[PDB]
Write a protein that binds this ligand. Sequence first.
Ligand SMILES: OC[C@H]1O[C@H](O[C@H]2[C@H](O)[C@@H](O)[C@@H](O)O[C@@H]2CO)[C@H](O)[C@@H](O)[C@@H]1O
Ligand code: NA
Length: 533
Amino acid sequence: KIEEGKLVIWINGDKGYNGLAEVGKKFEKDTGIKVTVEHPDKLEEKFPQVAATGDGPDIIFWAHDRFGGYAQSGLLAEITPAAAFQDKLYPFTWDAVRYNGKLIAYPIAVEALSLIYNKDLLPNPPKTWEEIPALDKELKAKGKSALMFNLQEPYFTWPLIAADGGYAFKYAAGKYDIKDVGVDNAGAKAGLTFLVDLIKNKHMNADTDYSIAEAAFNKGETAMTINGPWAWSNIDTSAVNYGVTVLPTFKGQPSKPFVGVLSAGINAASPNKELAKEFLENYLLTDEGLEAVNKDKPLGAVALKSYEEELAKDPRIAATMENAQKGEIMPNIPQMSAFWYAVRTAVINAASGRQTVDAALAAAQTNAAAMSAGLDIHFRGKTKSRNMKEKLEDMESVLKDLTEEKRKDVLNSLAKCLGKEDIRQDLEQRVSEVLISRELHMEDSDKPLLSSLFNAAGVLVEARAKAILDFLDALLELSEEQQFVAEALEKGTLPLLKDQVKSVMEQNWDPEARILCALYVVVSILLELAEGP
Ligand SMILES: OC[C@H]1O[C@H](O[C@H]2[C@H](O)[C@@H](O)[C@@H](O)O[C@@H]2CO)[C@H](O)[C@@H](O)[C@@H]1O
Ligand code: NA
């Protein structure tokens, strides 16, 4: 239960939350309404977890790319600003927050990654990625690194991966093709390979994360970093004489950052919706409110035209917008979280050597395709008494009691059902007949699974049959995600898929919910069979 007569606001810890709390203060002074601003960790995951139960903040700040998924899960109030208010913001910002024709958040600012360089160490920064190793080699001799940036978050490495041809979902003539994913093409492989080569040749470290990179640049130990506008404040506090510029090219093509619009959404369960709209339209999105935030940590190019004409004088904003033009605004579609989780794991696995480049990107492509199809609730037709957690837990313990041979025999039959409604329906008829009759018939003798339902005394174990019927009911819920589950089984990458399916489930373990639950069941069962308990 969110508390009436109060505003609670979540925003990321790298953003200007103290600035925002200043606006919160002004609001209370004018209206007597208390505003509390918080910066929880993992906010983008935590929000949909608490909001799914009707709890959480009244207001949520994140880049626009998450909001479509929140909207599809019913977690956000529809935003309806008057036309007089809308015309004050850049129209491309409203686009970023428009989902299936409705506005699902207020746009705040545009953020793009830039190349940030130390002027004293590197008066003329490199224009190509290809120069960097030689440059690092020379700087290392003098006790400095050429480039350090967060390799843990794919937001940071995606610009190199996209440069020669990687993409998330194909975008043609104003429409995204969620069935055409660009994660394992030649261009993405070339970029990720360049990155992994930098690591292997000791120009960067696989474990470099946000705070390490920040500290190194700000303490003058590295000539370059890659970061957003929010980072400029800490650099201002430090000794460093820095510039902000276009990212280096790769194979003669520009680095293509995914560009975010920081946005503010209103919790669908909030009992203070009118107060939130009032705080956002009349306090935050004003010259004065944006200035308070921007002076704590810079926002980038703000959505409010009146204040952005001031900020556009800064050449750091020009560089931000130069990179923004070379990159692409992210989609706000639910499938974005799928893309992100897949790419995140791939880059980390490739960087650390846990997977090769080709293998990391082939698995990511498979997972993103599977999860994208699951999140696409549209155009589906299904024709021609226990907790879902409870059922999976039951099913898994039954299969755990099997011998290993019997597990593989179950798996042989189930893998044949994937993508084949005829085979699935037939196995369902047979398992069900065996369950009633307690006997195997002649047409059962070539189905390994069906003998697997019997113990070494030749007697049927009813719970094995029921577990299988439960799996085949779940598999029916799935449409085209089935073929990607097969690929993952064939390539040995089900554990990545299971992990990614869990991360995508907004809630802790709704049409979106039914399908992903089913997908999690199917993947979990296949993994237990393929790799053991
Ligand atoms: O790394 C994947 C991640 O990218 C973006 O997250 C950014 C965010 O947009 C910035 O505002 C800032 O907080 O840095 C984050 C990277 O750590 C996407 O917005 C997010 O959905 C995605 O998971
Ligand atoms: Na562009």
